[PDB]
Amino acid sequence: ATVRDPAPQFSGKAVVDGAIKEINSNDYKGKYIVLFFYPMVCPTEIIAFSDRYLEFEKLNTQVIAVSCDSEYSHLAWVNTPRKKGGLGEMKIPVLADKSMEIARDYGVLIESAGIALRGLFVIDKKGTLRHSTINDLPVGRNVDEVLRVVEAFQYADENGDAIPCGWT
Amino acid sequence: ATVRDPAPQFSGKAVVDGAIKEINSNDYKGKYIVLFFYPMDFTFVCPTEIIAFSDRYLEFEKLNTQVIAVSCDSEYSHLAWVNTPRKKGGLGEMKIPVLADKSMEIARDYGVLIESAGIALRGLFVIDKKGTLRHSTINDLPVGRNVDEVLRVVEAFQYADEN
């Protein structure tokens, strides 16, 4: 499964607004989705997205972090001050994937180490894969770049799937 | 084939320094490799992307990395492409090699071939000094790639490889 393919549907229990909720990808139809995997290291990446969450909302997109761990420990993580390495008050959902079935479905699972690569995926309003960044574990991701990709794909979908030669 | 894997071998005839030369992936060991695919046959493709990469080549060379473009056509067409002024639609002087991929075996080897459009997705791949895959950006055709981001990724990987 790769780009221009209908993106693999995902569901499960996440921590949202400090609470555990069953969420499904089909719940986010009509909005873009940035699905990104945090391999269970520095939490500042996921925290960064959480801080820029409003900018993502301007573009009608939903960021969802995904990690190879339980919803209860994810709650434990949110119920920890950032000063101790925990997540503190999160503004984007943190989805549990102890089974790692989502990581496999997205091909960022290392079927030898039992860990996920830093995968990031942009899904459009019709539920199709538009972008896939995948990094080896040591290198983090950049929010400004993700926002750039999202706004570009949006302008494309609006202006007939074609971007002017030299955009902003 | 995914990240942390020894990268798929690529070889072929490229346009290097305004001339057709045989290049191999094994030729670039000891250096990073940015392998990126520029779809020509995309009816709305813009050369400003690959031109950009051509311009920032010095910045890539400071970091001991070799950017190689790969495009869906022969070394003769790539030469013809280089030998066409930009104000006439061509590439003009390119500062990175343009590798030929008419058979799209290189595109298939990297999993970027759209086996219906006969075109490759805008795939970008960072390869380390022992030749294993460290990064892969893949975009849908309408969205181009950013040189600054690539530079960030490469130097980040280098600092990691040292520390």
XYZ file of C-alpha atoms in Angstrom:
331
model
C 0.000 0.000 0.000
C 1.509 3.311 -1.148
C 0.653 6.815 -2.348
C -2.431 7.567 -4.475
C -3.974 4.515 -2.808
C -7.028 4.699 -0.494
C -5.390 5.016 2.937
C -5.617 2.020 5.323
C -8.528 2.552 7.683
C -7.612 2.637 11.359
C -9.490 2.544 14.666
C -8.847 2.152 18.391
C -8.873 3.859 21.756
C -7.046 7.161 22.061
C -6.594 9.756 24.818
C -8.591 12.866 23.891
C -9.119 15.937 26.098
C -7.585 13.863 28.882
C -10.010 10.992 28.325
C -10.087 7.601 26.593
C -12.282 7.522 23.475
C -12.823 5.018 20.622
C -11.893 6.832 17.428
C -12.001 5.620 13.819
C -10.490 7.041 10.623
C -14.022 7.039 9.172
C -14.916 9.565 11.881
C -12.620 12.122 10.195
C -14.160 12.217 6.719
C -14.212 15.758 5.321
C -11.000 16.754 7.070
C -7.366 16.029 6.240
C -5.501 13.694 8.556
C -1.903 13.839 9.631
C -1.247 10.454 11.136
C 2.189 10.182 12.716
C 3.960 7.427 14.618
C 5.936 8.020 17.796
C 8.259 5.027 18.410
C 8.267 4.021 22.082
C 13.838 9.425 22.614
C 12.389 12.934 22.826
C 8.653 13.815 23.298
C 9.239 17.347 22.039
C 8.192 16.226 18.530
C 4.661 15.120 19.433
C 4.427 18.022 21.867
C 5.407 20.361 19.020
C 2.498 19.197 16.927
C 0.229 19.566 19.891
C 1.313 23.206 20.262
C 0.820 24.013 16.552
C -2.585 22.305 16.711
C -4.514 25.521 15.919
C -2.572 26.115 12.728
C -3.523 22.593 11.746
C -7.153 23.389 12.554
C -7.100 26.458 10.291
C -6.556 24.004 7.435
C -9.314 21.645 8.558
C -6.858 18.858 9.315
C -6.636 16.477 12.221
C -3.305 15.426 13.661
C -3.345 12.022 15.337
C -0.233 10.664 17.061
C 0.209 6.893 17.184
C 2.299 4.909 19.583
C 3.165 1.276 20.248
C 1.585 1.180 23.690
C -1.643 1.027 25.692
C -4.334 3.669 26.132
C -3.943 3.544 29.915
C -0.214 4.209 29.812
C -0.903 6.921 27.242
C -3.249 8.413 29.836
C -0.490 7.998 32.421
C 1.750 9.862 29.986
C -0.713 12.745 29.523
C -1.204 12.739 33.290
C 2.490 13.645 33.649
C 3.930 17.193 33.592
C 6.160 17.935 30.589
C 8.948 18.780 33.056
C 9.245 15.064 33.891
C 9.214 13.847 30.306
C 5.445 13.354 30.173
C 3.054 14.863 27.670
C 0.967 17.217 29.811
C -2.086 18.854 28.281
C -2.365 17.501 24.714
C -4.484 19.111 21.998
C -4.228 16.277 19.481
C -5.360 12.676 20.068
C -2.850 10.058 21.162
C -3.837 6.695 19.786
C -2.875 3.364 21.352
C -1.473 0.544 19.188
C -0.012 -2.161 21.450
C -0.907 -4.735 18.799
C 1.032 -2.697 16.214
C -1.535 -3.642 13.562
C -1.730 -0.002 12.455
C 2.067 0.211 12.099
C 2.059 -2.864 9.902
C -0.913 -1.533 7.929
C 1.235 1.519 7.214
C 4.489 -0.351 6.615
C 6.583 1.447 9.208
C 6.765 -1.543 11.540
C 10.188 -3.185 11.875
C 9.272 -6.905 11.859
C 12.512 -7.770 13.654
C 12.998 -5.155 16.374
C 9.332 -4.846 17.360
C 9.449 -1.068 16.944
C 7.997 1.452 14.479
C 9.943 3.831 12.249
C 9.039 7.515 12.425
C 6.301 7.423 9.806
C 4.174 10.406 8.863
C 1.148 10.285 6.561
C -1.116 12.860 4.949
C -4.622 11.685 4.093
C -7.032 13.889 2.118
C -10.790 14.553 2.379
C -11.596 11.453 0.339
C -9.479 9.232 2.554
C -6.584 8.753 0.106
C -2.831 8.734 0.786
C -1.228 11.950 -0.471
C 2.120 12.001 1.289
C 4.405 9.690 3.209
C 7.488 10.789 5.092
C 9.325 7.933 6.793
C 12.504 8.512 8.878
C 14.977 6.232 10.636
C 14.582 6.497 14.434
C 17.207 9.213 15.232
C 15.698 11.954 13.040
C 12.660 13.989 14.028
C 10.057 15.655 11.834
C 9.331 19.327 11.092
C 5.889 20.912 11.586
C 6.438 23.768 9.141
C 7.142 21.236 6.403
C 4.002 19.229 7.232
C 1.910 22.408 7.189
C 3.504 23.247 3.797
C 2.579 19.849 2.312
C -0.960 20.050 3.661
C -1.672 23.555 2.371
C -0.167 22.656 -1.006
C -2.330 19.535 -1.392
C -5.309 21.631 -0.357
C -4.595 24.301 -2.983
C -4.203 21.510 -5.532
C -7.531 19.861 -4.651
C -9.113 23.309 -4.903
C -7.346 24.515 -8.040
C -7.730 21.381 -10.169
C -4.886 19.240 -8.798
C -2.208 21.546 -10.235
C 0.107 23.902 -8.331
C 1.546 27.082 -9.956
C 5.255 27.025 -10.787
C 6.760 28.383 -7.560
C 4.248 28.408 -4.702
C 4.171 29.629 -1.085
C 11.794 -2.806 0.821
C 11.771 -0.081 3.508
C 14.019 2.071 5.738
C 17.116 0.668 7.526
C 17.574 -1.613 4.514
C 20.583 -1.680 2.172
C 19.327 0.525 -0.648
C 18.325 -1.022 -4.011
C 21.308 -0.900 -6.378
C 21.022 1.525 -9.273
C 23.261 2.017 -12.299
C 22.951 3.359 -15.820
C 23.720 6.083 -18.305
C 23.387 9.582 -16.870
C 24.008 13.114 -18.044
C 26.970 14.273 -15.992
C 28.632 17.659 -16.570
C 26.707 18.134 -19.816
C 27.891 14.717 -21.025
C 26.647 11.100 -21.028
C 28.544 8.996 -18.454
C 27.932 5.595 -16.847
C 27.241 5.951 -13.116
C 26.717 3.250 -10.485
C 25.411 3.480 -6.915
C 28.555 1.722 -5.659
C 30.517 4.660 -7.068
C 29.197 6.946 -4.363
C 30.204 5.103 -1.196
C 31.772 7.339 1.452
C 29.227 9.969 0.462
C 25.539 10.428 1.193
C 23.180 10.047 -1.764
C 19.985 11.995 -2.383
C 18.145 9.935 -4.971
C 15.121 11.744 -6.251
C 12.624 11.094 -9.025
C 11.426 13.882 -11.267
C 8.266 12.922 -13.186
C 8.487 14.450 -16.656
C 5.298 12.970 -18.037
C 3.222 14.789 -15.416
C 1.262 17.222 -17.582
C 1.599 19.924 -14.883
C 5.175 19.314 -13.742
C 7.476 22.238 -12.971
C 11.236 22.112 -13.507
C 11.753 24.725 -10.765
C 12.089 21.872 -8.309
C 14.953 20.013 -9.957
C 16.470 23.356 -11.008
C 16.459 24.323 -7.339
C 18.299 21.134 -6.411
C 20.793 21.920 -9.173
C 21.460 25.349 -7.705
C 21.946 24.268 -4.081
C 24.468 21.623 -5.105
C 27.291 23.421 -3.291
C 25.311 23.168 -0.059
C 24.921 19.455 -0.717
C 28.677 19.148 -1.425
C 29.575 20.848 1.840
C 27.785 17.899 3.449
C 29.539 15.280 1.280
C 26.305 14.247 -0.429
C 25.557 13.496 -4.066
C 22.151 14.470 -5.411
C 21.070 12.300 -8.302
C 17.904 12.971 -10.228
C 16.174 10.018 -11.884
C 13.772 10.579 -14.721
C 11.487 8.374 -16.847
C 13.386 8.428 -20.187
C 16.733 7.638 -21.933
C 20.164 9.273 -21.541
C 19.724 10.704 -25.023
C 16.489 12.438 -24.075
C 18.051 13.664 -20.869
C 20.917 15.082 -22.883
C 18.402 16.709 -25.225
C 16.659 18.038 -22.120
C 19.780 19.551 -20.700
C 20.628 20.902 -24.155
C 17.475 22.987 -24.201
C 17.301 26.514 -22.745
C 15.050 26.952 -19.703
C 13.256 29.820 -21.425
C 12.471 27.187 -24.066
C 11.313 24.570 -21.523
C 14.582 22.702 -20.930
C 16.851 22.321 -17.896
C 19.859 24.267 -19.092
C 23.049 23.609 -17.130
C 22.391 20.949 -14.476
C 24.898 20.533 -11.623
C 23.667 17.082 -10.580
C 23.588 13.908 -12.707
C 20.340 12.935 -14.391
C 19.986 9.158 -14.515
C 17.959 7.425 -17.217
C 15.008 5.200 -16.270
C 13.017 4.314 -19.416
C 12.537 0.724 -18.214
C 11.425 2.126 -14.856
C 13.264 -0.767 -13.204
C 14.955 1.775 -10.930
C 11.562 3.319 -10.186
C 10.120 -0.159 -9.520
C 13.089 -1.062 -7.312
C 12.200 1.919 -5.103
C 8.455 1.315 -5.193
C 7.503 4.639 -6.741
C 6.100 3.461 -10.063
C 2.430 4.121 -10.755
C 1.790 0.984 -12.794
C -1.086 2.639 -14.674
C 0.156 6.129 -15.520
C 3.653 4.885 -16.372
C 5.047 7.638 -14.210
C 6.799 7.679 -10.838
C 5.667 9.472 -7.695
C 7.819 12.329 -6.445
C 10.023 10.093 -4.336
C 13.066 11.304 -2.462
C 15.523 9.013 -0.695
C 18.462 9.721 1.602
C 21.192 7.066 1.545
C 24.105 6.887 3.993
C 27.818 6.179 3.610
C 27.419 2.427 3.903
C 24.525 2.696 1.475
C 21.476 1.934 3.625
C 18.138 3.734 3.342
C 17.718 6.406 6.029
C 14.815 8.478 4.743
C 12.019 8.345 2.171
C 9.695 11.171 1.185
C 7.001 10.222 -1.302
C 4.537 12.797 -2.602
C 1.583 12.646 -4.853
C 2.429 14.241 -8.192
C 0.931 17.701 -7.662
C 3.224 18.652 -4.721
C 6.953 19.404 -5.078
C 9.793 18.924 -2.584
C 11.861 21.373 -0.497
C 15.657 21.612 -0.651
C 16.017 23.142 2.837
C 14.162 20.202 4.408
C 16.378 17.709 2.593
C 19.471 19.535 3.832
C 18.115 19.425 7.389
C 17.438 15.708 7.143
C 20.892 14.926 5.735
C 22.887 16.905 8.309
C 20.693 15.479 11.086
C 21.556 11.990 9.899
C 25.242 12.933 9.764
C 25.288 14.296 13.321
C 23.593 11.074 14.388
C 26.145 8.908 12.540
C 28.910 10.741 14.411
C 27.196 10.740 17.825
